[PDB]
Amino acid sequence: SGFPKLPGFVPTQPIEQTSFKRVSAAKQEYNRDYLHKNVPPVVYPLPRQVPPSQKGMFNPNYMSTTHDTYRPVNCPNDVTELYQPTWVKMDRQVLRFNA
Amino acid sequence: MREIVHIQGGQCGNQIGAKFWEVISDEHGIDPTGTYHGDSDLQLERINVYYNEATGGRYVPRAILMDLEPGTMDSVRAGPFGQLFRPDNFVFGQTGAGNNWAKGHYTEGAELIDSVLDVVRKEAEGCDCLQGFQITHSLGGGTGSGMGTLLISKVREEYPDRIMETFSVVPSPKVSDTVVEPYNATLSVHQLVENADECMVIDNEALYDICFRTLKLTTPTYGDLNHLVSAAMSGVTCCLRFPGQLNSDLRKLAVNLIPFPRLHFFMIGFAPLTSRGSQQYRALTVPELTQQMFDAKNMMCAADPRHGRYLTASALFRGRMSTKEVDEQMLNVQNKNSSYFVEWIPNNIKSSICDIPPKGLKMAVTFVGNSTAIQEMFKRVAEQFTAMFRRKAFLHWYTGEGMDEMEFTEAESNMNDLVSEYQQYQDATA
Amino acid sequence: MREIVHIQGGQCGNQIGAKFWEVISDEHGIDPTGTYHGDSDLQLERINVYYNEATGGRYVPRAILMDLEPGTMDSVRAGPFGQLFRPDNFVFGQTGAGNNWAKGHYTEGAELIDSVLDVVRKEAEGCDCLQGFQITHSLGGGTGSGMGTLLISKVREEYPDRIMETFSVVPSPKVSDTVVEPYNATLSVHQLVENADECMVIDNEALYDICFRTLKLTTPTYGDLNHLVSAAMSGVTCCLRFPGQLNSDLRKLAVNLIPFPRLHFFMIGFAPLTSRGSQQYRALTVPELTQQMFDAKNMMCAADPRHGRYLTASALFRGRMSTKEVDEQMLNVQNKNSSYFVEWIPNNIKSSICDIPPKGLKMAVTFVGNSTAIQEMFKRVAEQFTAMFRRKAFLHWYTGEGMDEMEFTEAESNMNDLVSEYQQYQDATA
Amino acid sequence: AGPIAASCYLGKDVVSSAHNAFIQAVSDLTTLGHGLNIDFGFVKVYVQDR
Amino acid sequence: MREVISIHVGQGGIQVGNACWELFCLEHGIQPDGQMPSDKTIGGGDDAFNTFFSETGAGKHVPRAVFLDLEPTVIDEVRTGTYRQLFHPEQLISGKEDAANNFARGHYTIGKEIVDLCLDRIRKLADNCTGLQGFLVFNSVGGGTGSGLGSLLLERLSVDYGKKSKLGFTIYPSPQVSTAVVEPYNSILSTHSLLEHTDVAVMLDNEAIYDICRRNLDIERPTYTNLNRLIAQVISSLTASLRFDGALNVDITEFQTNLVPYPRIHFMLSSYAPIISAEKAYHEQLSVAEITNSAFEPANMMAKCDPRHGKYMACSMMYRGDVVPKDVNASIATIKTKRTIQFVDWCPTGFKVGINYQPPTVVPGGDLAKVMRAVCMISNSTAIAEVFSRLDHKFDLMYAKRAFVHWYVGEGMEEGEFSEAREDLAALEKDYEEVGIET
Amino acid sequence: MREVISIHVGQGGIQVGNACWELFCLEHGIQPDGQMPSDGGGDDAFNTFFSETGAGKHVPRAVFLDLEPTVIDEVRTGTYRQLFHPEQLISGKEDAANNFARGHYTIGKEIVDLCLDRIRKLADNCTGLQGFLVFNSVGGGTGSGLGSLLLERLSVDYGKKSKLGFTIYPSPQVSTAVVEPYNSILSTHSLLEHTDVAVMLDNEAIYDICRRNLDIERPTYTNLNRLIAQVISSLTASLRFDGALNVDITEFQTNLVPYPRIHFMLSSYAPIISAEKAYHEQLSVAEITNSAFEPANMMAKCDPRHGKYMACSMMYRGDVVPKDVNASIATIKTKRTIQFVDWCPTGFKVGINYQPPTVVPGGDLAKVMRAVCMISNSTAIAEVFSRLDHKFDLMYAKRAFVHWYVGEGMEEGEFSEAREDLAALEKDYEEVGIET
């Protein structure tokens, strides 16, 4: 499989490839060293949790022109929850043991 | 010993780099990790030529990458064989040149010499007995010719006894990529004649001319164009890195191909190349090597080598073969084509034989020649420059960052004179 | 050694190529794949006369195929033995011919001639000792005549001593293959006479006449007519290739067949030929062989050979035979038909022996002689040419690509002049 | 420099090099003391110890 | 690497293009929706079809043709017929208002706004081809938009492309049978316009072909479809040499350099043989001598012109099938021997022969029989002067009283264009008279 | 480390900005909420139009401005409420109502202060900001007046950094207002002396492009945005995707601006083939480029033939190999119907990007494998300036509508100076083209 490397012997244009995003030099080390033995910690659940608002009124006749065309793209629905970083949700949680 | 260190400039400089190391790495048997797996002793015999030893078994290229915009050094290190370039030597600013010969050579380049100049000096201090430098820079690119020439202007200032080599990609007339191509074409050339020991001209117009007619491959790419060139540079210095019959160091190339001080531009090419449909039906004998070497369509330059006369030429045989036919065949070419070779330089072809052939073939040859035809390239570049300057078109971009149009006029006089001087001997007789 | 190269032009020129290499390929025993399975070394003692050498033992034709339109060239590729030729030898235009000499000789063919001259020059210099050329082109076609003749004209200029073999196809008035044929014919001869050395005129009528009264076959294609001629070509070239009693190449043939410098139009034929239903009773002996060779009806030119006086002729027997039964026969014919041979050149028929008869037979003959009967062709073409020109009809086209009137007047006078001299010898007496 | 060497009728190359030699204010300023006043026209430049 | 582009303008042009393109689709095995037949599965098809069709890269084929008309009826019929998926959607240019038999309308008022779109489409078609042999145009002369747009596009193409050869299969009115009333006017105007703009013009009046159908095909009630089928067969016989191997090939360029003695003389009449209904074919042996003698029958001419009244200038005939050269020669010699067929003095050699191997194809539902041999004959003769003389007389009979002229003078064309057209026709008749006199 | 901050002003700017943002969202996989699914890693190409917050979501480096609060509110209540920074969609309390003087001297100064502060912060985070993209409408009072003032301040504080503006002048014969000739002419002086590069985007030309190709007889402004959306997509796409031949934003004012004054160039786009029949032609690079120069597809309503070309730079994206581009470029020179100016032998800046064109959901454009965008400065541009010339002079003949500008604090004589600027600009265009 060490094919003879001479000009015109190995096609270059990779027709089989799909994505060509440019990885920056800064994170080049990011995908080889840092994230190999590390994790952004977790989004764990909670034992005691005990639902967004109504959004029940979406009349189609009174649909503003600027909204009926640009529907939520790439989303199953136009979600309403306000994202927060990992640390935000889990504030002030603790576990304990004795040894 | 007598190793060299490479300086590549500009995006065109970086991409062209991305290949020869790859091919250079291929011949020595250097794996991407840097772990040696060659088969014979020869591949490691002269590893110092393009690598220094580092603890851990993987080999450090003596590469210095320069470019005003970070992207080029970004992609070069992302694809295959991109991890061999070791991060310390990377140098990049924050601005980019925008094809402004002014921007890359006085505005930003002038501000950056410090770090890059520091690193190169150290690497040269590393080598045991320095041989010279090689450079890849883009004349039609503002930054390349801009940053590239200054260092080249700077480098000769401190290494008076080291030969200097420069591969140049001048813009062809047919297909153009930049509108400011004429202006930056002359300015880089003017500074190139006064400092470079050897500069090689390669016309992108020819390559595509070379690819369609010889390689007959349906869909080339800049990788392929890079492929062709990358082989040549390995062609010039190949014999130096391996034992052989007639060792011919790059300096010896300077001895036998520069007639006078100011005519230090040559034209080169690589062969033989076969097709997807002709590789099995051609012939493999010495006559084939000589037949294609002088063929018009193989020279990487837009100038046809028949519109003028060869002042001198050199052929570096690669691989084993009967020297009888190497010397005799040249005697075949010289005699039947006297009119095309000046008559006061008898025996005006250089020959060399190297014992290590390219990976996968039996015979190989690389060609370097200084021909009068090159006047065609400078005139059209010269002719174009006069066309735009009479109307002061696009003059402001260069006038508003420190320059005066007197230098532009000064550049033309030298460039025009070289064109006139270069052609004086064609009508001269003995 | 003393090898030759072949170039063919035009559909008739091209078509003969498909058959021509077919018979030559089998004579030495070349298969469709081209590998050598030859039985006796007699098939390879002089193989290089028509083939080169490459890797794997595959032997490649010394072929150069050139035309204005690709369609006819496309067909020759897909048939049997269509894989011997290499692509590099091929050339083709894009506009076509249109049976107009102007577009074939001044404007269109001018642009493409560079490639053929380059490709023709590649083959010749490589060969050991070039001996001559064989041109097979059609006078009745635009691209044929235009590109064809101009190809003959240019070649002579660069080469001083090369011999030439030219096989043409003059149009007969009965089979009007092109209304513009008369004009084209006169133009072709004018250029031909000044550079062509040896030309063998074969009338398509004889090929048709031959196919019915000689072979007695029902439905022949142009392959058979292509088949008939191909035998003649190999008939002349064999002696230069195989062992024989008195070796005689093409040039040796010329010295004995052209009495004066420009009376050099010859007449050729084949024998013995017999039908499927009539090839069982006759006796196959040279005495029967010679009988069919001199008989006028079998001769492959519509010019009746009994209306003129023979000047020079050559005999090239094939197969084994003793000197006696061939020579004594030849002496017999000279005396018994005194009135038909000129008086101021005695013993004016040449004979030679070749030691390898065609495969599948026992004896055969190929004849070439200079006879005054050929004067019938030019005058009749001469009369036709004047007829169309007195009304200027169809004259406009030739004037539509830079040509001019006095060219036609000059050409007509010479051809009228050429006929003038070729007959003054007929009535000449000692 | 460009239109400066033509200004004083001096070679183009020397001026640029001459520019560097005067430039090293640090070397003459790195040492102690040696206050300076570089005016050369409309504006004046002064320096104490540092 | 050899391609042709066909131009169809007018109702007659569209209705003959349909018959041409059904035959071209059938001959190369392409089904109406543009794809190769689904099972196929023989593999490796040779792409002869490049001459008329264009490959889209994966799947269907787009013909290299463009249809023009100002009335949308026929174009809508084409876009709703079985061949809706074949042609490209935007190469079927259509207008809104008909020309109404007025030459000045489609040449000065409304034809000017369609010519730009047509020329743009032609340019976009041309760059795809690398071996463009020439252009073909079909147009009914005795009509308004047909003649007008034909003349306009020919005038524009003469300067836009220059030396590229153009062939015209025009249709002049019959000597006495006609459908319109002002057909001599626009007929003469179009003839004047294309006299210096078309390389080859072929006579295709309907009365002669009606007679051919009645006499040979044994059809007592023919319609335009049979007429178009015969025209398409002639086109196929003419262009078969470019995509099928043969013993002696001919090109489109090897037509107008052999049948045009002088630039003004480029009108000729066609013939085709054999045209036989199977009822009789079963009886005869249709040899090559029979078909080549039938090609010269004056009653078998495709035009209502008698060759017995004039001399021949140049005769070109193309063969296809299993013909052998020897029999062709033997038949040509016999024809030259015949006394009732005489050539002009200054043309000693007057025949060009083309030989092809592909036998003619048979369209299902057609009238012609399946045979092994056929010939297409194109000859230039002196006898064509009579149709011009008759047309000039018919034109003069009305122009003496300036009838119907206001329909023409009110639409942008001046009064004097009739006079110069009449002078040009008179000069044409004078030239056709002078060319035939013995030297 | 590449950053381009987008500046928008005016409903034409906002809606065009709105539409173009969905296209940039889908291309990088940015979900509407602002969190990337992603999963590897790396591929930080989204930086060009986004900035990390250290941990979590991402934001567009854009500022939306306007004086009439209604338009901005709709975006604030639409699907994209979760994407933009709440305190960057500045809104006022009153509108200008096409009284350009209103947007320049009366109402604007109460909003300029905050806008300058915003541009302060967004650039602060970047490292190598290439410049700004300014989208605006000249056919409006409030948009132009803020559109004018903002342009002036950008040069003063920063200076040499790049600036690009996609203005939309009124159509030749189709107009939305009746006071555009005043606001159209008076803006020119504002935009001629301050922006390096700007492009024409006349609306009614696009209607021709949409009607002729897509086969939609009832288009709306929303579709007009998308076609403009792709135009910006290709010009900047070279900066966030690897390729064989790159181009930079800074490398446009150095290949399309022969002199400071002449800085107006026209755009064009192709192919635009409806998927209904898109696959009835081969989509070869040979056929694609020709559509670029075709007069019927010019983005702005001017016939390019009336004058000479000065310099056209074309950007390629898709699977086009440079071998094809070299051949096709040669063809354009050969044609005898298109000509170049005497003093510009070489005028092409060719760029190629491998990434194919992204087809947005709910759009009309079909999916094709190749496309090219042309940005050329041609002598034909005289038409737009020629036509606006007549309208301003005629309507100004009898002081019609002037009284609304006198009383707002704008000097009557100022209109005297503005007219000359066109005269000064008008003369140069003719002057340059004449043969030497």
Ligand SMILES: Nc1nc2c(ncn2[C@@H]2O[C@H](COP(=O)(O)OP(=O)(O)OP(=O)(O)O)[C@@H](O)[C@H]2O)c(=O)[nH]1
């Ligand atoms: N041979 C033949 N001739 C036709 C056919 N259709 C129409 N014609 C001829 O066309 C003439 C009238 O013109 P049309 O073809 O009907 O229409 P046009 O030429 O497009 O001109 P307009 O009527 O203005 O549209 C008639 O006299 C016919 O001779 C056809 O299918 N076959």
Ligand SMILES: Nc1nc2c(ncn2[C@@H]2O[C@H](COP(=O)(O)OP(=O)(O)OP(=O)(O)O)[C@@H](O)[C@H]2O)c(=O)[nH]1
């Ligand atoms: N391309 C495009 N332009 C638009 C659109 N809507 C309006 N315009 C342009 O906007 C111009 C008029 O300005 P306005 O739409 O009123 O926006 P403005 O200039 O900020 O003025 P105000 O509405 O008062 O804010 C018109 O001439 C149009 O050219 C659109 O949907 N697409």
Ligand SMILES: Nc1nc2c(ncn2[C@@H]2O[C@H](COP(=O)(O)OP(=O)(O)O)[C@@H](O)[C@H]2O)c(=O)[nH]1
């Ligand atoms: N053949 C070939 N030419 C190249 C390549 N990269 C750049 N060039 C040439 O370099 C010119 C552009 O140079 P440019 O990128 O502006 O140089 P920069 O200033 O360093 O960015 C083009 O005209 C090309 O001819 C390459 O990979 N192959």
Ligand SMILES: Nc1nc2c(ncn2[C@@H]2O[C@H](COP(=O)(O)OP(=O)(O)O)[C@@H](O)[C@H]2O)c(=O)[nH]1
């Ligand atoms: N005998 C014979 N003659 C041929 C053949 N092919 C072409 N010709 C001759 O060529 C003449 C026509 O010339 P043309 O085909 O136009 O030549 P081209 O233009 O060079 O291709 C005819 O008169 C034929 O006699 C062939 O296979 N056999």
Ligand SMILES: [Mg+2]
């Ligand atoms: Mg508003």
